[PDB]
Subunit: 128 residues, 2 copies
């Protein structure tokens, strides 16, 4: 049975596996009469989710949208309202996250004086 | 020590604390060959798959930090290649960063999940 409490919980348990994604997508398609609330809760929990988990939300949307087409256009329509914000948000997090380990590695070398300040700056500059 | 043997250990190198620190110890044992080591290390870094390249930098980090109590040679030797090394690693991270997002949009465009107008709108969002 559908509830927002149940959805929020399932979303909090979503793993970056195709199984996790397709399992949840099925439940949502089953509950597609609630496509409005579902997409709204999805968006909310996406923005709230830890940085490493946000991409998986977009793949969940992918599975839902393609698999629901043969049922009705309600999910395609509902997702359309939030996807530009969702893609913009994830792309922002990506731009920040992809080189974060490298940034952090230079901070460690800075902290520990592994190399002088001038050279650390060169290293930092070399990444942009 | 052999450049051959090093190339092997380098192919077998993983992201575990054990794998990195074990290889680092061997290299510090063979610090008389610091020149050759950094040259081979740099060659293999560039040929390594993108998600392995951070692990090469972590090996350099461990060699550099731990070698210091033995002499300045590994610090000096790495210093002559690390600007090039970070630049390369950073560049590859930048290239691959948003490929998952781009693939979702490429699937949707082809399979007509949305139209070009909206598709291009999501495309622009990745800049955002």
């Amino acid at each position: 049975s559908f509830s927002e409490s149940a959805l929020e919980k399932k979303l909090s348990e979503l793993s970056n596996s195709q199984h996790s994604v397709q399992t949840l997508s099925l439940w949502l398609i089953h509950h597609r009469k609630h496509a409005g609330p579902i997409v709204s809760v999805w968006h909310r929990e996406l923005r709230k989710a830890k940085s490493n988990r946000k991409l998986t939300f977009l793949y969940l949307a992918n599975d839902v949208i393609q698999n629901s087409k043969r049922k009705g256009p309600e999910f395609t329509r509902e997702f359309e309202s939030v996807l530009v914000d969702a893609f913009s948000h994830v792309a922002r997090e990506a731009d920040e996250g992809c080189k974060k380990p490298l940034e952090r590695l230079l901070n460690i070398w800075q902290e520990r004086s592994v190399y002088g300040g001038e050279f650390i700056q060169q290293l930092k500059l070399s990444m942009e």
